[PDB]
Amino acid sequence: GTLIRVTPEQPTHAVCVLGTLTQLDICSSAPDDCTSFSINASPGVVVDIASTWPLDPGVEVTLTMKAASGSTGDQKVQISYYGPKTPPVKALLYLTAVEISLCADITRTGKVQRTWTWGPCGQGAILLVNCDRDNLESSAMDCEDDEVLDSEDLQDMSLMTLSTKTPKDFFTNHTLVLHVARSEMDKVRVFQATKCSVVLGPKWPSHYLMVPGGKHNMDFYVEALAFPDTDFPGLITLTISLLDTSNLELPEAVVFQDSVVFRVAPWIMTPNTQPPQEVYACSIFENEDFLKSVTTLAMKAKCKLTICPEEENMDDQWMQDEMEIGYIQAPHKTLPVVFDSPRNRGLKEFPIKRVMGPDFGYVTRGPQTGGISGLDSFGNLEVSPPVTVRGKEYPLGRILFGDSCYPSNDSRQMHQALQDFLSAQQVQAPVKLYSDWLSVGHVDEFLSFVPAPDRKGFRLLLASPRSCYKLFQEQQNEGHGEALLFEGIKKKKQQKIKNILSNKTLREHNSFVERCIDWNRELLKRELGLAESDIIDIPQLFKLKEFSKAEAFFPNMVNMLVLGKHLGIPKPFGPVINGRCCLEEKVCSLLEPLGLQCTFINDFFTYHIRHGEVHCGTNVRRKPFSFKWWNMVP
Amino acid sequence: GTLIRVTPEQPTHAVCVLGTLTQLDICSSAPDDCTSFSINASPGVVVDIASTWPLDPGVEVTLTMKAASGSTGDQKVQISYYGPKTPPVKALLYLTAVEISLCADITRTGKVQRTWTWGPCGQGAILLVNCDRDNLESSAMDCEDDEVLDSEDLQDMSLMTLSTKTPKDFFTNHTLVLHVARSEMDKVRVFQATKCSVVLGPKWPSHYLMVPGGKHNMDFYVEALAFPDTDFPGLITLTISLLDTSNLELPEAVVFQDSVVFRVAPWIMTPNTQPPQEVYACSIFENEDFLKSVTTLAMKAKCKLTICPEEENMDDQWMQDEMEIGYIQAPHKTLPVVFDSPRNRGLKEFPIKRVMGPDFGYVTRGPQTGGISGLDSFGNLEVSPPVTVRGKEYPLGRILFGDSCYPSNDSRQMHQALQDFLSAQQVQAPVKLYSDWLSVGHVDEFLSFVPAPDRKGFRLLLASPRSCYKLFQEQQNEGHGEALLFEGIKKKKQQKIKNILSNKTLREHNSFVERCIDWNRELLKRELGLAESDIIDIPQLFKLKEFSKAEAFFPNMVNMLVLGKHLGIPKPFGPVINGRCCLEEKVCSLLEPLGLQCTFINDFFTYHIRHGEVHCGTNVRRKPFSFKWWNMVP
Amino acid sequence: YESCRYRQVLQL
Amino acid sequence: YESCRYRQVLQL
Ligand SMILES: [Ca+2]
Ligand SMILES: [Ca+2]
Ligand SMILES: [Ca+2]
Ligand SMILES: [Ca+2]
Ligand SMILES: [Ca+2]
Ligand SMILES: [Ca+2]
Ligand SMILES: [Ca+2]
Ligand SMILES: [Ca+2]
Ligand SMILES: [Ca+2]
Ligand SMILES: [Ca+2]
């Protein structure tokens, strides 16, 4: 608001900004012997008493202007004070009205109060972290320097319009300032468009603006610098302030202050139910068959392909564990972003050189110079499809990562920096699982999501040893106990059905593994609102080794590659009956009536020997969600 | 929940914890040729199908136990599978039920889900930061070490009861564990009461518990270590986990996990409308009259008194700027806490030696070895009484601190650590004001709160120069312009009314000061839901000096000491008419009809010369709010 | 935490 | 911030 009191001794000059209610205090300087007052104003202004009225402090007077001023002091308001003694006293007030409007994409539409509220009925604009490189001759993220090097970069910013409508000689006695609070001055940068030079950044908290009189519009471009984290909730305030500088001896006086609130776009992942767009892989040695199978699967699925040759590969074939692809979106642009794990094996150059580029951001967190564990591999990093739990909706899913049940002396955990970053990204509130028992410790080794036409749309697949044991019991009691597992593989010993069925240590180990799987299944059923109809069991066998950790007895068939309605499942080399393996037949009969095609790829000698599967060695980029994140209420 | 599937091949032993729903999966191991099933159970258990029923996966079976088990495997449930071929197949399940209950003061009552929700209908217990020293022979905050040195310290903790009801031989094949997440293990400590030894702390993430069979109860005492901050929201989780250790070769398996959530009590201030309990002051030199006036005011107000002698004073008399007293409360105990400013003038020993003691906590934030500004003095630290703004209630008021209008090169600000701490204390969301223009820069120099019988209960008092100018205009035009200001003071020059009224530079400076005061008044009116009837103007005059900063022309009468219904107001030494000063008469006639008594104390030669007033040199302790903070929803 | 603040102040 | 993470990774 604006409070201007009138004094009969001398006339008063004041500025009334259009869009702001201005109340007149009419008792501060009122004549002592006075009893009543009257108001007469010019037609250009509207006066509301909320003929003669008493001067009691309760009553109030509001003034509203309709059009911008063409000249200084072009409206006049007169107040006649009526007293029982002496003639009435006249007080004068001169009004000049300006129009100062700082506007952004507050409606989240794409065209250009003062608070950011989630939900479809909310208001507040969105920034995008300029984490890409639109310059083809640069070797730095374009938000590191203080210049705009190419007009295409302008598309990754946010627009802000300053509309000014003032008289011609207005700004000879007034000044405009743009600023951001000192705690956020190091997480934002603002350029002025005329081609563009910096205005606000990590070294200039505030800048004075040069604006001419009359009508004018100014264009500002805003770019964020840091993703939201524990120390930075994500709200950035930009403030426009009008200062009076009439007298040179005196300092400036603030007379009007408007502001806008921006939210930094969070990092949003993509689950397995989204259509693919691009597939990454690796080539190291004896990989012609594996790469050929991946290529034909990609061709069938109608997507791209990117392959790293061995020169830059450095004998590292686990693309999944190093990088994870998500997206960041805003009403005017949606661009993917690669997340680089603190793990720095031979593939530390691929995500930093061959991935990030034009319209491909890059962000990473944690300590890079060692001090991590296997749980930091992106194996413990999955997302469930949109879910509804006990009346609360998550249209963007929930992050799932695994760690130890309780802290101890030999327990491991995901790095705290990564955990806090994921938690700070609210839109997918993370959920913890118990996956420390695995030797590598990857939640990708026991859970998987598949798109389904019916019911909720998805179907979680979990590894369960009982399923394999019942299949083997059937194979034995129909009389084919002579079947040899690992027949196709020559180097590894073939095992007959009776021996594996009568083994006792293996049964005990699989009972322990089943108990862990049951606990995780109950956790997922509680946290994702699942019934028993949305969970499918795929047979598998686990065996314990040094320090009692579980490893896949035969290739893990839960860690499969899903591309729309096509599946690349690791070949188990299970026992064959009537010229078809029982494991493959069972899994095909379990997944096909859902509307899928199953293709088994062999990676025993190239991946399984080094404790890996297909999905652990390939990565997929997926189309961003159609649902706008800002429309969800956390 | 608990999922136990039955297999007809062999009987199954399982543990069903009382208070947990247990569902039976009856299709995982069901006979292939089977078509129907029946259930018969012992009377001790209750079975619900949610006679013969189909074995379709949709149907489910729930099991509920009523009483704790006296012996292992004392309940039996039998399932008869009926098939068109072969005789029916019988499956068995043996049940032993235990009772494990970890309980705290979740109802916020004082007597001894799994989430902390604010509001009167919420649930969740409260910890207290053990920031006092109950040991009279110790020189450390009692939460620094890892021992309990006196039974009285036990009163500053939180109780937790572990109730166990199991068979006699139960714990020969099971184990209990207590733990806290690794990110909160360094902000909590838990002792076991038998006298008490540590169980959980910043060096033991988890501890195994030794419990006997039968009935038993265990007492745990919990104490927090850190106040809530930006890096620590305030939620602490303590988890009890039951592990199965039947087989020695295999590792432990988690089978049940309960938890409790605690909130660390925030630091809550006290406004000026609360009754006083204790008054602090100082004595340096020529202070007999000032101290005597403070003593008689305290005696009239029925409170205590604490005085610092000059040996420990080190020629520092501004107690207000160094320390601020608030309280922290929990359903079982409420204790005050002193907040020490980063300012380290001669009074750095009083808050650390003569204040903190038995039932008096101490907490401080910021950099101590320099790097602060005058705005860090507790002058910019006030609280408004309970307020209702636009339908939202604040029964504990709002923090008010001042800083610059916009960031610049010569602007100052409160330290970011203090600002983030105050923001992290949610219960009083802070409000910023424009008080950089003052030479010292203290919001205590222009605003003040007074208790009022009527209306909202309070009345904000603001410094306004116009009030003084209208009083002087009246004094001149009634013919007493000969009155001399500063008559009582001999060293300072006396000023006549005509000269001060006709001064032009002073009028310009006071116009600037009035503009700043008007902006702050509008800010407060917007942020505290005030009308024009809740704000009282007390006359004052400001003058500008080096770098154009405002100083009080005559003693500041807004910075007064309020003790219930008694007032110590600095004596302005204003011009006198008919043997009474006009300023004192006006202020007395303005404050008395509210129901107060006004006493003027003289501190011109001892405080005003060093740019200070009474309230800036004394501190008051006040009774905590009757309204429970946890009852407010932020 | 707050204990460390206590020790640092007492030292000064 | 995130730029500094970029430079540190590229150095390694
Ligand atoms: Ca740039
Ligand atoms: Ca860009
Ligand atoms: Ca890396
Ligand atoms: Ca771009
Ligand atoms: Ca992944
Ligand atoms: Ca202790
Ligand atoms: Ca204590
Ligand atoms: Ca101190
Ligand atoms: Ca105590
Ligand atoms: Ca204070």
Residue numbers in the entry:
A (entry chain A), B (entry chain B): 4 to 53, 66 to 127, 136 to 217, 224 to 663
C (entry chain D), D (entry chain C): 1 to 12
What does the paper say about this structure?
The peptidylarginine deiminase enzymes (PADIs, or PADs, herein referred to as PADIs) catalyse the post-translational conversion of protein arginine residues to non-coded citrulline, in a process termed citrullination or peptidylarginine deimination. PADI4 possesses a nuclear localisation sequence and targets a variety of nuclear substrates, including core and linker histones, through which it modulates gene expression and chromatin compaction. PADIs require calcium for catalysis, and the sequential binding of calcium ions results in a large structural rearrangement that forms the active site cleft. We report PADI4_3, a cell-active inhibitor specific for the active conformation of PADI4; PADI4_7, an inert binder, which we functionalise for the isolation and study of cellular PADI4; and PADI4_11, a cell-active PADI4 activator.
The lead-activating peptide, PADI4_11, lowers the calcium requirement for activation in vitro and induces activation within cells in the absence of any additional stimuli. We then used cryoEM to elucidate the mode of binding of PADI4_11 to PADI4 and were able to obtain a structure with an overall resolution of 3.6 Å. As for the structure with the inhibitor PADI4_3 described above, PADI4 adopts a homodimeric structure. PADI4_11 adopts an alpha-helical structure with the internal cyclisation bridge between C4 and the N-terminus of the peptide acting like a peptide staple. The structure revealed that PADI4_11 binds to a surface of PADI4 distal to the active site, but close to the five calcium ion binding sites. The peptide binds in a cleft formed between two loops in PADI4 (D155-V171 and P371–387). PADI4_11 binding in this region thus fits well with our observations that PADI4_11 activates PADI4 by reducing its calcium dependency, since peptide binding likely alters the dynamics of this region and may, therefore, directly increase calcium binding affinities. By contrast, substitution of E2 by alanine, aspartic acid or glutamine all resulted in loss of activity, suggesting the importance of the appropriate side chain length, as well as negative charge in position 2 of PADI4_11, in allowing it to form a salt bridge with R394 in PADI4. The structural and mutagenesis analyses presented here reveal that PADI4_11 binds at an allosteric site on PADI4, in a region of the protein that is disordered in calcium-free crystal structures but becomes structured upon calcium binding.
